[PDB]
Amino acid sequence: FGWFNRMFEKSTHHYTDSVGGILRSTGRYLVLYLIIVVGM
Amino acid sequence: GLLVDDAIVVVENVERVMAEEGLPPKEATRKSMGQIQGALVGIAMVLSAV
Amino acid sequence: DRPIFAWVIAIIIMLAGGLAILKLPVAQYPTIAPPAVTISASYPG
Amino acid sequence: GVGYDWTGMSYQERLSGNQAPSLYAISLIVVFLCLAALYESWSIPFSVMLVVPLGVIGALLAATFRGLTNDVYFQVGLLTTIGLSAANAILIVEFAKDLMDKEGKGLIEATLDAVRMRLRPILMTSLAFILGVMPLVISTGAGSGAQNAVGTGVMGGMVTATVLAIFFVPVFFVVVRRRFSRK
């Protein structure tokens, strides 16, 4: 019926353009990675 | 785990290319491993690396 | 024949022999001697 | 004339200390190395090499927020979820650099195309994994204190090696931030 429908909506925008959102940014994760690394 | 997961890719990639490329037969499998050549050998060689 | 693969093979042969040189300290010889098992007793006087 | 000496527990020369710094050392010289086999440049061995803290972060989270501690099963438990995490990163990096070079370009607009067709594996690989380690994390509080120690260190380190490695930091920044911006 449409169980495949759930993650297909999660794939586009909610994942694909979401990634295109932080590749548009990048900057915040130069230190957030270091927050994860030095946090661990 | 690992063993199930190294096999999951080649099983899925054929199910993936049939839904995408449209071509149904053995030749669909064929080309899948064209993008999983070093992603089988190299990954194993760096699995063993740890 | 591309380079990046071979230039890693050299590193394997580099590190394998570099870990095998850790047989330090390595002895001069090579055992030549046909085995010598000695029995000794002392009866004083 | 009272001179000290050490015996049984006094190792001798073993433990985790003086073992781990030479454990992960050659677990790094080779991890970087064969990540150039069919891969080549100084780029890709950062497109995967640095996805390792995404695994570890949850493993200590599972250890610290539970009471469990860094033993052998957590040691090898940390080691499985690091190459298994790689087998997802190095797998999408494969899909990425095969969408470029061997195919036809994709600085940003094929990295997406690569990460548009394999989230099946990268998630169901993890989904079958998480649940496979679930009979280990608990299920038995009497059968073993080993399955708990081996399992919690995996799936705790796995959930973050899945969710933070599906879209967050290293991933994508692996082929974008860790290849170009400079060279």
From Swiss-Prot, chain B:
Subcellular location as annotated: Cell inner membrane
Transmembrane segments: 37-50
Loss of function: phenotype: Loss of susceptibility to contact-dependent growth inhibition (CDI); inhibiting cells still contact the target.
Inducers of expression: Positively regulated by MarA, Rob and SoxS transcriptional regulators (at protein level).
Cytoplasmic topology ranges: 12-36
Known role: AcrA-AcrB-AcrZ-TolC is a drug efflux protein complex with broad substrate specificity that uses the proton motive force to export substrates.
Known partners and oligomeric status: Homotrimer, with large domains that extend into the periplasm, interacts with AcrA and TolC. AcrA may be required to stably link this protein and TolC. Interacts with AcrZ. Part of the AcrA-AcrB-AcrZ-TolC efflux pump.
Protein family membership: Belongs to the resistance-nodulation-cell division (RND) (TC 2.A.6) family.
Record protein name field: Multidrug efflux pump subunit AcrB
Source species: Escherichia coli (strain K12)
Name of the gene encoding the protein in the UniProt record: acrB
Boundaries of the shown chain within the full protein: 403 to 452 of 1049
From Swiss-Prot, chain D:
Induction (free text): Positively regulated by MarA, Rob and SoxS transcriptional regulators (at protein level).
TM ranges: 19-35, 46-65, 72-90, 120-139, 146-165
Membrane topology, Periplasmic segments: 66-71, 140-145
Subcellular location: Cell inner membrane
Disrupted gene: phenotype observed: Loss of susceptibility to contact-dependent growth inhibition (CDI); inhibiting cells still contact the target.
Lineage: superkingdom: Bacteria
Record topology, Cytoplasmic segments: 36-45, 91-119
Family that this chain belongs to: Belongs to the resistance-nodulation-cell division (RND) (TC 2.A.6) family.
Chain's role: AcrA-AcrB-AcrZ-TolC is a drug efflux protein complex with broad substrate specificity that uses the proton motive force to export substrates. (Microbial infection) Involved in contact-dependent growth inhibition (CDI), acts downstream of BamA, the receptor for CDI. Its role in CDI is independent of the AcrA-AcrB-TolC efflux pump complex.
Assembly and binders: Homotrimer, with large domains that extend into the periplasm, interacts with AcrA and TolC. AcrA may be required to stably link this protein and TolC. Interacts with AcrZ. Part of the AcrA-AcrB-AcrZ-TolC efflux pump.
Full protein name: Multidrug efflux pump subunit AcrB
Organism the protein comes from: Escherichia coli (strain K12)
Lineage: Bacteria, Pseudomonadati, Pseudomonadota, Gammaproteobacteria, Enterobacterales
